[PDB]
Design an enzyme around this catalytic site. Structure first.
Site, PDB file in Angstrom:
ATOM      1  N   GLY E  69     -39.625   9.026  60.366  1.00  0.00           N
ATOM      2  CA  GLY E  69     -39.143   7.677  60.154  1.00  0.00           C
ATOM      3  C   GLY E  69     -39.917   6.936  59.084  1.00  0.00           C
ATOM      4  N   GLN E  70     -40.583   7.680  58.206  1.00  0.00           N
ATOM      5  CA  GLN E  70     -41.347   7.069  57.130  1.00  0.00           C
ATOM      6  C   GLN E  70     -40.410   6.423  56.114  1.00  0.00           C
TER       7      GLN E  70
END
Ligand code: GTP
Ligand code: GTP
Ligand code: MG
Ligand code: MG
Lengths: 177, 18, 415, 180, 180
Positions: E69-70
């Site tokens: 989820g960067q």
């Protein structure tokens, strides 16, 4: 041609993925610009077979400066491969990490290099010593910040004469520049 | 047989030198 | 300190390239071919090229030039040694060194190139050791590379323990046109094919002059080897201490020691050749070969090459022993003799025509080279004394060795 | 009775034999035993008790019972004297002050009426320094020729190198076995 | 043509299926994948790239492709959208400030004309703290009922415990396979 190769490389069959990797390797050696397919080959990178992993690593190393942006999708794979029980896989991962001329990739490779610096396997130790010198040549400031000079110095006074010689050569190369 | 001279057995050490 | 090791071809195409540092652009290889062509056409061609700030140092192979680009002040000797090791590894893995295997063995060739050198510093060069981790038909690397003994894989077992030695002599004579020999040196070559069980520690012992003097027996026939070059398995410290040649033989055929000492004896074969070359009319070759070697030794496959005229045609050979054939490709008369007993004397009378029109440019006088090969004859007189084969398990070895006498740089200057 | 089974066993090798490992502490006894059994110079702590091992060579199981040279373990050599057929003495030529102690210990161990069939086996340990004596000076100092009814043999073995171990093993086999 | 081999393969199970692992970072996606594959709560560093694994259950090879989820990896989810049949969304109910970001990312990923056959799979991760919402409040906030032509199912799974994973797997199998 290119579309067929991409479809073969994006399949779930290992017999076709290996053939696609071999064709891509031959095209690059034959003098074909296969850097446009670097993102497609990134998906077929984490493979159990060692024969295809070496080809993927070689393609990434030869297609790293051309597409540095597309090389950001390999740090996790390198980190995962830097802890494999097989010394050959760890050595190959260490060699590929230092061979990638990416400014945004060597920063995150300091942890694997530090982990492999004290590796018990003499081949792993030599690979880490070579990778430290490669990182210092690429980024001297990053190597100095990581404190690899102290680890490199202790390599000469340890066992594994081949690893000791490799560490001495790396230290001489670092001091040469 | 063999061209270039037949192979000859070698000793183990200088028995005359102890 | 090579930057990128690449393999070229006869047409300038790079068969395979493998960058090790990346400090040299891959496009510099294209300028290597024009630079080599310019150097060859002006007499300034050298194995080490220079494309601006990048030096292209490489050797010439059978069909491709293994040019290794570099930019810094890298060791030229180190680059040459790495190229020689790569050539030896390719020869061990592939029976032929040509373009037929470069384009067919790329899968294993790339792996071998990657494993051989990392960052321009080679780490593994043993073909036997490398064959256990990189194959074209992967397990963990063998402990031999990590261990000190990197030239003898542990665990080797054989039904019998037989080691075959080969004391090959190289008779090189540099005879000037005046009739005297200038460079007359004999280089020994102790090549052994060790095939035993385990990792025996061979203790080679010969009748060396230094060893005989140290032991006090400096009165018998002792070989005075001016230069002795031991192999990697041979311990340099042991040889330096008390002339003790102790080393672990490898698995297969390898060169243990390479002696090299000057020779002050008369040549084994003496060639007395005359050139009664008429001025554009004919030529005479009164070549006589005298065997100065012992009569008990026979020089099998004696080939005394007599350089005949390049434009000579309709030649006739009047010899006594051995067939004489003129090869237009080589432009010389091959005095081939099957068996040459010691003390024999073969006389030949060459007779060939010459065109009336003189040649536009001079062709030179190539030296006459003999190809005598007398087996079971040691010119240097060095004889093997003992071979201490010691194994921890304990076994009875059956060492063997043969002495072969041949001709090396045995060229005779023409008049 | 029938001895066909014994003959069949002896046709391929049946005799094993035994051996003893005694001597002064730090005399290379443990290293010598490790080299004979394994073939490497293993560094071990001083033998507080004893070490028991076996060596398979020439179809004979040469069992070696290492005994320390400690003062508290010097009088404990009589425990291994029961059911013992061989005895190996490890000398310390690098300890001039301990040479007399080793000779006295060997004389005391050799003056027992129970250990009579064990032939003498003198091993010149620590044969790597220039101060080590030859194979005759040590024997002359120890008076090995004055041991009546004792078959002693002096052999020089290098702990670091391992040379002479094969000769000592062959001599022990020839002394123990009296067959072809 | 003949389909006897296909029938024989299907008599014992031939369908495998696929699955996707997307969501915000630190949402239990890696831990959920480890629990599904191995069955233990393994602590791993943040997923800089992606993780690819497979799960064998009900004779169907449920391959899971974990996606971080960067921010630099959020727009990289389109790489796995090619040749993808399933999609699993991991919500972060313990991050009120990140709930809006996760909903926006899900809406952006759900607004692609290429990813249409992938049914919705909402997994309530981090179901161990009292601040976690129920199976309807999170869906109501995310507006899962407003996804036309999307078969979404909200399931609460505890990363530390592992409860509800079997129910989610059964629901995914029922949505993918339409046979007995
Ligand atoms: N470096 C070296 N040391 C030797 C050699 N021979 C004997 N020694 C010394 O002898 C000692 C041998 O000790 P061990 O092998 O452990 O067994 P040991 O001989 O019975 O000695 P203790 O255990 O004390 O009774 C070593 O600690 C060495 O210091 C040799 O050839 N080279
Ligand atoms: N203790 C605890 N932590 C949880 C639980 N559920 C989620 N987490 C947190 O969620 C994180 C899960 O990270 P990973 O399993 O490594 O993979 P991820 O969910 O994709 O997170 P990223 O790798 O950063 O993308 C953990 O670091 C936990 O801090 C739970 O049930 N118990
Ligand atoms: Mg001991
Ligand atoms: Mg994760």
């Amino acid at each position: 041609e290119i579309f067929e190769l991409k479809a073969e490389l994006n399949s779930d069959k290992k017999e076709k993925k290996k053939e696609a990797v071999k064709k891509v390797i031959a095209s690059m050696t034959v003098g074909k610009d296969v850097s446009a397919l670097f993102p497609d080959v990134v998906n077929c990178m984490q493979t159990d077979n060692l024969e295809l992993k070496k080809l993927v690593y070689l393609y990434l190393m030869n297609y790293a400066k051309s597409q540095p942006d597309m090389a950001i999708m390999a740090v996790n794979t390198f980190v995962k491969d830097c802890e494999d029980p097989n010394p050959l896989i760890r050595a190959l991962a260490v060699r590929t990490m230092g061979c990638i001329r990416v400014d945004k990739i060597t920063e995150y490779l300091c942890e694997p290099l530090r982990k492999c610096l004290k590796d018990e396997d003499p081949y792993v130790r030599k690979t880490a010593a070579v990778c430290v010198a490669k990182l210092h040549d690429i980024n001297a400031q990053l190597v100095e910040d990581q404190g690899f000079l102290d680890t490199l110095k202790d390599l000469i006074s340890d066992s594994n004469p081949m690893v000791v010689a490799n560490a001495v050569a790396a230290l001489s190369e670092i001091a040469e520049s | 047989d063999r061209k270039g001279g037949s192979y000859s057995q070698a000793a183990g050490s200088d028995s005359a030198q102890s | 300190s090579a930057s990128a090791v690449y393999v070229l071809d006869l047409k300038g195409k790079v068969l395979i390239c493998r960058n090790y540092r990346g400090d040299v652009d891959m496009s510099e290889v294209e300028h290597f071919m024009p630079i080599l062509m310019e150097k060859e056409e002006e007499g300034m061609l050298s194995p080490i090229l220079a494309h601006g700030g990048v030096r292209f140092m490489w050797i010439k192979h059978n069909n491709l030039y293994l040019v290794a680009t570099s930019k810094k002040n890298a060791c030229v000797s180190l680059v040459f040694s790495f190229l020689y090791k790569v050539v030896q590894v390719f020869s061990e893995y592939f029976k032929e060194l040509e373009e037929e295997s470069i384009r067919d063995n790329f899968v294993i060739i790339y792996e071998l190139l990657d494993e051989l050198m990392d960052f321009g510093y080679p780490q593994t060069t043993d073909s036997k050791i490398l064959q256990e981790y990189i194959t074209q038909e992967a397990p963990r690397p063998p402990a031999t590379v990590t261990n000190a003994v990197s030239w003898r894989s542990e665990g080797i077992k054989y039904r019998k323990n037989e080691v075959f030695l080969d004391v090959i002599e190289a008779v090189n004579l540099l005879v000037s046109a005046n009739g005297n020999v200038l460079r007359s040196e004999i280089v020994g070559s102790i090549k052994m094919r060790v095939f035993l069980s385990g990792m025996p520690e061979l203790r080679l012992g010969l009748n060396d002059k230094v060893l005989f003097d140290n032991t006090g027996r400096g009165k018998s026939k002792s070989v005075e080897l001016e230069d002795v070059k031991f192999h990697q398995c041979v311990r340099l410290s042991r040889f330096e201490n008390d002339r003790t040649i102790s080393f672990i033989p490898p698995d297969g055929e390898f060169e243990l020691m390479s002696y090299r000492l000057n020779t002050h004896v008369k040549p084994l074969i003496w060639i007395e050749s005359v050139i009664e070359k008429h001025s554009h009319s004919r030529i005479e070759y009164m070549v006589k070969a005298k065997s100065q070697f012992k009569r008990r030794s026979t020089a099998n496959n004696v080939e005394i090459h007599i350089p005949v005229p390049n434009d000579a045609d309709s030649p006739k050979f009047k010899t006594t022993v051995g067939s004489v054939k003129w090869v237009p490709e080589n432009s010389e008369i091959v005095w081939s003799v099957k068996s040459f007993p010691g003390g024999k004397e073969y006389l030949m009378r060459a007779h060939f025509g010459l065109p009336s029109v003189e040649a536009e440019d001079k062709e030179g006088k190539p030296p006459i080279s003999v190809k005598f090969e007398i087996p079971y004859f040691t010119t240097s007189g060095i004889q093997v004394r003992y071979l201490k084969i010691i194994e921890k398990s304990g076994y009875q070895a059956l060492p063997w060795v043969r002495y072969i006498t041949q001709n090396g740089d045995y060229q005779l200057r023409t008049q | 009775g029938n001895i066909f089974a014994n003959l069949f066993k002896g046709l391929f090798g049946k005799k094993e034999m035994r051996i003893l490992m005694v001597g002064l502490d730090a005399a290379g006894k443990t290293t010598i035993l490790y080299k004979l059994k394994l073939g490497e110079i293993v560094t071990t702590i001083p033998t507080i008790g004893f070490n028991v091992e076996t060596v398979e060579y020439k179809n004979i199981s040469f069992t070696v019972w290492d005994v320390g040279g400690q003062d508290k373990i010097r009088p404990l050599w009589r425990h291994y004297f029961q059911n013992t057929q061989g005895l190996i003495f490890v000398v310390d030529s690098n300890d001039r002050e301990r040479v007399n102690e080793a000779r006295e210990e060997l004389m005391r161990m050799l003056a027992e009426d129970e250990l009579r069939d064990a032939v003498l086996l003198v091993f010149a340990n620590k044969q790597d320094l220039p101060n080590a004596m030859n194979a005759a000076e040590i024997t002359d100092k120890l008076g090995l020729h004055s041991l009546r009814h004792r078959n002693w043999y002096i052999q020089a073995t290098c702990a670091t190198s391992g040379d002479g171990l094969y000769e000592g093993l062959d001599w022990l086999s020839n002394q123990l076995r009296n067959q072809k």
